[PDB]
Scaffold this active site. Structure first.
Site, PDB file in Angstrom:
ATOM      1  N   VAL A 140       0.826  -1.194   0.000  1.00  0.00           N
ATOM      2  CA  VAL A 140       0.000   0.000   0.000  1.00  0.00           C
ATOM      3  C   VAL A 140       0.857   1.240   0.000  1.00  0.00           C
ATOM      4  O   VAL A 140       0.394   2.313   0.389  1.00  0.00           O
ATOM      5  CB  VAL A 140      -0.938   0.061   1.226  1.00  0.00           C
ATOM      6  CG1 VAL A 140      -2.016  -1.026   1.120  1.00  0.00           C
ATOM      7  CG2 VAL A 140      -0.134  -0.108   2.504  1.00  0.00           C
ATOM      8  N   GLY A 141       2.111   1.084  -0.424  1.00  0.00           N
ATOM      9  CA  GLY A 141       3.005   2.223  -0.477  1.00  0.00           C
ATOM     10  C   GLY A 141       4.384   2.075   0.146  1.00  0.00           C
ATOM     11  O   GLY A 141       4.782   1.001   0.623  1.00  0.00           O
ATOM     12  N   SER A 142       5.118   3.185   0.140  1.00  0.00           N
ATOM     13  CA  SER A 142       6.469   3.225   0.685  1.00  0.00           C
ATOM     14  C   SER A 142       6.956   4.664   0.801  1.00  0.00           C
ATOM     15  O   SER A 142       6.224   5.613   0.482  1.00  0.00           O
ATOM     16  CB  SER A 142       7.427   2.424  -0.208  1.00  0.00           C
ATOM     17  OG  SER A 142       7.333   2.853  -1.558  1.00  0.00           O
ATOM     18  N   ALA A 195      10.711   7.079   2.558  1.00  0.00           N
ATOM     19  CA  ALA A 195      12.042   7.115   3.171  1.00  0.00           C
ATOM     20  C   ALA A 195      12.129   6.237   4.420  1.00  0.00           C
ATOM     21  O   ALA A 195      13.214   5.787   4.809  1.00  0.00           O
ATOM     22  CB  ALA A 195      12.397   8.547   3.533  1.00  0.00           C
ATOM     23  N   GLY A 206      10.216   3.268   4.900  1.00  0.00           N
ATOM     24  CA  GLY A 206      10.169   1.859   4.538  1.00  0.00           C
ATOM     25  C   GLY A 206       8.901   1.491   3.774  1.00  0.00           C
ATOM     26  O   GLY A 206       8.022   2.336   3.546  1.00  0.00           O
ATOM     27  N   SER A 207       8.811   0.228   3.371  1.00  0.00           N
ATOM     28  CA  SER A 207       7.649  -0.277   2.643  1.00  0.00           C
ATOM     29  C   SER A 207       6.549  -0.640   3.625  1.00  0.00           C
ATOM     30  O   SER A 207       6.814  -1.045   4.758  1.00  0.00           O
ATOM     31  CB  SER A 207       8.002  -1.540   1.855  1.00  0.00           C
ATOM     32  OG  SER A 207       9.187  -1.385   1.094  1.00  0.00           O
ATOM     33  N   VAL A 208       5.308  -0.524   3.174  1.00  0.00           N
ATOM     34  CA  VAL A 208       4.162  -0.864   3.997  1.00  0.00           C
ATOM     35  C   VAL A 208       3.144  -1.707   3.223  1.00  0.00           C
ATOM     36  O   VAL A 208       2.778  -1.371   2.096  1.00  0.00           O
ATOM     37  CB  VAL A 208       3.453   0.403   4.522  1.00  0.00           C
ATOM     38  CG1 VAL A 208       2.235   0.011   5.351  1.00  0.00           C
ATOM     39  CG2 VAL A 208       4.434   1.235   5.351  1.00  0.00           C
ATOM     40  N   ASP A 253       1.391   8.554  13.820  1.00  0.00           N
ATOM     41  CA  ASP A 253       2.809   8.886  13.862  1.00  0.00           C
ATOM     42  C   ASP A 253       3.082  10.278  14.403  1.00  0.00           C
ATOM     43  O   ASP A 253       2.975  11.287  13.691  1.00  0.00           O
ATOM     44  CB  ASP A 253       3.465   8.695  12.477  1.00  0.00           C
ATOM     45  CG  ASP A 253       2.702   9.381  11.352  1.00  0.00           C
ATOM     46  OD1 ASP A 253       1.550   8.983  11.066  1.00  0.00           O
ATOM     47  OD2 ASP A 253       3.268  10.318  10.746  1.00  0.00           O
TER      48      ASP A 253
END
Length: 345
Positions: free
Chosen positions: A27-29, A31, A33-35, A165
């Site tokens: 579902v994206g990435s 700086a 990391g990948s998610v 976050d």
């Protein structure tokens, strides 16, 4: 008690996770990391599984990695993104390299909510109520979010909200950008040490916007933003001036034509007067005089939701590690310790 892990390569990234997580979908990435979005067969929820990229590349990164894990493990509140799980395929510290965080996947942030529909006053009381509820918890632990914004607020189909976050380069804060529009002036111009009152200022900005459909302080830069702010809340008085360390900032502030606070009833025309009152209490130039999250929950605007018995505080959060200088390998070990010692809720 080590779960069985399984590997796979999805979009050029190798994911090695416990079998409890199924149907992983990128579902994206960025700086960070990948998610992947996943089905957590234990909790039954849709979850976000983030693989941290080079969490220990440098002393600074290794610390940030540790800090985020520490903050996520502490948060246990309905209105604050908590950690559902954290893991690494490594069987020892020697093998330890990758870290995975599992958080609940809410769906869309506050920005996406406002794009799809027009929010009623009832929607706004409830959304601000929840923000304040989660902030009281955060602040009770002496933790400051530092960068509260609509994009850091996840919401779901039932209007339930969670703070994402927390604040963990100024370039991201230059120009006509949303990333700076919700910041208290005292931190935007580095006038003083920021305390939790900085978050209350962000809440006022957000609530004002949800009420008007417009950004409260869309500055073209830091100074332009400061002028939009001073215009609304008035220029500083002598008592607020003494609190500003920099002699230059003071000289600058004293160069401005002095202005009085504007009438909020004539700025937020047609808004619930209780909301107007609350905003005046949140958008106070002097951070020491801003209303606190706890006090705000008790304000009449939230009478329909307020429940002093269902608005919990947190356990103390120990941030002594912030003023500690360690090597990369030591920060990594601490991080490793936090992972393997994680206890499910």
């Amino acid at each position: 008690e080590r779960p069985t892990f399984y590997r796979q390569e999805l979009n050029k990234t190798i994911w090695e996770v416990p079998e409890r997580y199924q149907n992983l979908s990128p579902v994206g990435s960025g700086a960070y990391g990948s998610v992947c979005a996943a089905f957590d067969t234990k909790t039954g929820l849709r979850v976000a599984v983030k693989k941290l990229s080079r969490p220990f590349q440098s002393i600074i990164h290794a610390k940030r990695t540790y800090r985020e894990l520490r903050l996520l493990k502490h948060m246990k509140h309905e209105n604050v993104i908590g950690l559902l799980d954290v893991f690494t395929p490594a069987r020892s510290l020697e093998e330890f390299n990758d870290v995975y965080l599992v958080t609940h996947l809410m769906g869309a942030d506050l920005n996406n909510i406002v794009k799809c529909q027009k929010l009623t006053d009832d929607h706004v009381q409830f959304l601000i109520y929840q923000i304040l509820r989660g902030l009281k918890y955060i602040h009770s632990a002496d933790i400051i979010h530092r960068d509260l914004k609509p994009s850091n607020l996840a919401v779901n189909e039932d209007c339930e909200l969670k703070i994402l976050d927390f604040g963990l380069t100024d370039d991201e804060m230059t120009g006509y950008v949303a990333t700076r529009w919700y910041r208290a002036p005292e931190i935007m111009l580095n006038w003083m040490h920021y305390n939790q009152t900085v978050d209350i200022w962000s809440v006022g900005c957000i609530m004002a916007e949800l009420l008007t459909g417009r950004t409260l302080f869309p500055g073209t830069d830091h100074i332009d933003q400061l002028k939009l702010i001073l215009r609304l809340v008035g220029t500083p008085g002598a008592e607020l001036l003494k609190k500003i360390s920099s002699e230059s900032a003071r000289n600058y502030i004293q160069s401005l034509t002095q202005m009085p606070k504007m009438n909020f009833a004539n700025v937020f025309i047609g808004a619930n007067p209780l909301a107007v009152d609350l905003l005046e209490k949140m958008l106070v130039l002097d951070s020491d005089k801003r209303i606190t999250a706890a006090q705000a929950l008790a304000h009449a605007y939230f009478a329909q939701y307020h429940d002093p018995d269902d608005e919990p505080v947190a356990d103390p959060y120990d941030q002594s590690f912030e003023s500690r200088d360690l090597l990369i390998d030591e920060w990594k070990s601490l991080t490793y310790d936090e992972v393997i010692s994680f206890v499910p809720p």
